[PDB]
Amino acid sequence: GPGSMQRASRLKRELHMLATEPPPGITCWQDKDQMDDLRAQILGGANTPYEKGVFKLRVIIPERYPFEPPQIRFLTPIYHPNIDSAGRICLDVLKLPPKGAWRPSLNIATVLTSIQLLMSEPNPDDPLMADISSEFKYNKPAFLKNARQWTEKHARQ
C-alpha cells in the first residue's frame, strides 16, 4: 500500500545517504535482497577501551518503520554496562515513548550515532549488565582492562 510504498521510498533514501555520506566511524549497508535485514559497523572511539575495535551490528527494519524503531543488536561481542552477552542494547532511542525516545524524525544513521555515543558514555545507573555496571562505577581501572581485553579478543581481526 502507500504506507509500505512510503517506508520503501524512505529506506532507499536512507541507504543511499549511508552509502554516499555516512557518519564518521559509522557504516550501514544492504548485503541481501531484503532492504529490512541490514548490516552496520561502528569503529571503536578514540580514548575509549573499544579503540581499534571494529563492531558489527544487525539492523532489522520492522514493517511499521519509521513509527516503530529499528531493531539493532551487536553481532560483535562487547563488554559494556548497557549491552548484554546476546548483543541486546539498552538505549532510549531504540524504544517507543513513554519509556523510550524513538520518534519518526530519527533515522538509522542517528540511532547508530547514539549507539557510538553509548559506547563512549555508558549509563551504568540503568544497567543491562549489573556486574559490568558495578565494575564501571566502583573499579574503573578493572572495567577498562576487561573492556580492552574483550575488544582484542572479539573486535580485532
Curated annotation (Swiss-Prot):
Domain of life per record: Eukaryota
PTM: Auto-ubiquitinated. In contrast, according to another report, autoubiquitination does not affect E2 enzyme activity.
Active-site residue numbers: 90
Effect of residue 77 to K: Decreased FANCD2 ubiquitination
GO molecular-function term, one example from the UniProt record: ATP binding
Protein's pathway: Protein modification; protein ubiquitination
Cross-link (Glycyl lysine isopeptide (Lys-Gly) (interchain with G-Cter in ubiquitin)): 95
Known disease link: Fanconi anemia complementation group T: A disorder affecting all bone marrow elements and resulting in anemia, leukopenia and thrombopenia. It is associated with cardiac, renal and limb malformations, dermal pigmentary changes, and a predisposition to the development of malignancies. At the cellular level it is associated with hypersensitivity to DNA-damaging agents, chromosomal instability (increased chromosome breakage) and defective DNA repair.
Subunit and partners: Directly interacts with FANCL. Interacts with BRCA1.
Family to which this protein belongs: Belongs to the ubiquitin-conjugating enzyme family.
Protein name: Ubiquitin-conjugating enzyme E2 T
Taxonomic path: Eukaryota, Metazoa, Chordata, Craniata, Vertebrata
Part of the whole protein covered: 1 to 153 of 197
